[PDB]
């Protein structure tokens, strides 16, 4: 493969020169064209040290970045762009919040590479499809609950037990179980049931103020930096909500109109004759996303800018609820849509 090859020995370009505000809370990764994505996973693990701290193989780093990128499929939201776009804000909360501060190194490592694998394998249902629709997966993994996660979890350890492909393959024996450890709490963390179990546990934490000799604070906030990289989309401007709605309502109505075709009545949300995409949108982020934000600000000042941009965003969708409703006639001039 000559994506492999031009990988390998090209070198790893300078972070800087991928774009100038590239390192900032104001950049839109999924600006990149998709073709630049694996030069700049490994322009950021290089940035970020990971490269020579652990003597990572550059033909087998090479090799995993485009596994995990082929392990991708093309739904409408959760594709390779949605991985890309988590680990570049797992970068920027590195370069932006001082991490070193509050985690341990092989923490902040395992939770950029968690961001790549985290929706591996994604095949544009929910957990609840899974098991409604009886599938293979739902067999291997309903009975311990998070089952995509679960999926994507086995799909970033396949990926490691294929040859020429283990990043990790010359780490300590603890080092190793420890990785594959954090892999596993991380991406089990992306399901949202689970972060809504442990909020209660966040805020105390927040309330209590982070003690970074306290094991149980570690696995807290990694649970809500992945939460924090998962719905980054919402930090961005107007333009990436939108676009990020429209992705994430055609890929919800896709499986809506699968569950009509079992005989299941779909979630309000997931029915394209029943969703109203402004009252979802703003309920999303005043119940979802922006006490995750909050919670992010709190334990980090300087991440002020992301709750006020996911609030912004709020927002502009109450803004332009208006624009649902259609006044006078449509541009055809005819009500023939009756
Ligand atoms: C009350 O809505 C929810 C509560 C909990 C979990 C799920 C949702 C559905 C709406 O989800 C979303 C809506 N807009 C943006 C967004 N980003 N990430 C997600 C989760 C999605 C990929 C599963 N989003
Ligand atoms: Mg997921
Ligand atoms: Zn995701």
Same mark, same amino acid.
């Given at each position: ?15 800087? =020169? ?15 064209? *998709?073709?630049? /994505? ?85 095949? @544009? ?31 970033? %350890? ?5 040859? @020429? ?24 963390? /992306? ?17 209590? @103020? ?33 676009? %990020?709605?429209?992705? %994430?309502?055609? *890929? ?8 009509? =075709?079992? @005989? ?53 969708? /109450? ?20």
């Amino acid at each position: 493969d000559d994506e492999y090859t031009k990988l390998l020995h090209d070198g790893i370009q300078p972070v800087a =020169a991928i774009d100038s505000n590239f390192a900032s809370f104001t950049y839109t990764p999924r600006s990149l064209p *998709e073709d630049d /994505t694996s030069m700049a996973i490994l322009s950021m693990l290089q940035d970020m040290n990971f490269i020579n701290n652990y003597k990572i193989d550059c033909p087998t780093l090479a090799r995993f970045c485009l596994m995990v990128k082929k392990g991708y499929r093309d739904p409408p939201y959760h594709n390779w762009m949605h991985a890309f776009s988590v680990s570049h804000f797992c970068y920027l909360l590195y370069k932006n919040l001082e991490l070193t501060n509050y985690l341990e190194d092989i923490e902040i490592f395992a939770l950029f590479i968690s961001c790549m694998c985290h929706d591996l394998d994604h095949r @544009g249902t929910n957990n609840s499809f899974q098991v409604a629709s009886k599938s293979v997966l739902a067999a291997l993994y309903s009975s311990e609950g998070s089952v995509m996660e679960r999926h994507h979890f086995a799909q970033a %350890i396949a990926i490691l037990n294929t040859h @020429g492909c283990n990043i990790f393959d010359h780490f300590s024996r603890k080092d190793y179980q420890r990785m594959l450890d954090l892999m596993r709490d991380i991406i089990l963390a /992306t399901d949202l049931a689970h972060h809504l179990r442990i909020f209660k546990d966040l805020q105390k934490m927040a309330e209590v @103020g982070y003690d970074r000799n306290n094991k149980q604070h570690h696995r807290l906030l990694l649970c809500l930096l992945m939460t924090s990289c998962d719905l980054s989309d919402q930090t961005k401007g107007w333009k990436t909500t939108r676009k %990020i709605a429209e992705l %994430i309502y055609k *890929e919800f109505f896709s499986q809506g109109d699968l569950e009509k =075709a079992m @005989g299941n009545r779909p979630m309000e949300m997931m029915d394209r004759e029943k969703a109203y995409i402004p009252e979802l949108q703003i309920s999303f982020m005043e119940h979802i996303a922006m006490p995750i934000y909050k919670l992010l600000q709190d334990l980090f000042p300087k991440a002020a800018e992301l709750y006020e941009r996911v609030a912004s965003n709020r927002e502009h969708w /109450t803004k332009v609820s208006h624009k649902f409703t259609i006044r006078g006639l449509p541009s055809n001039n005819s009500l023939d849509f009756l």
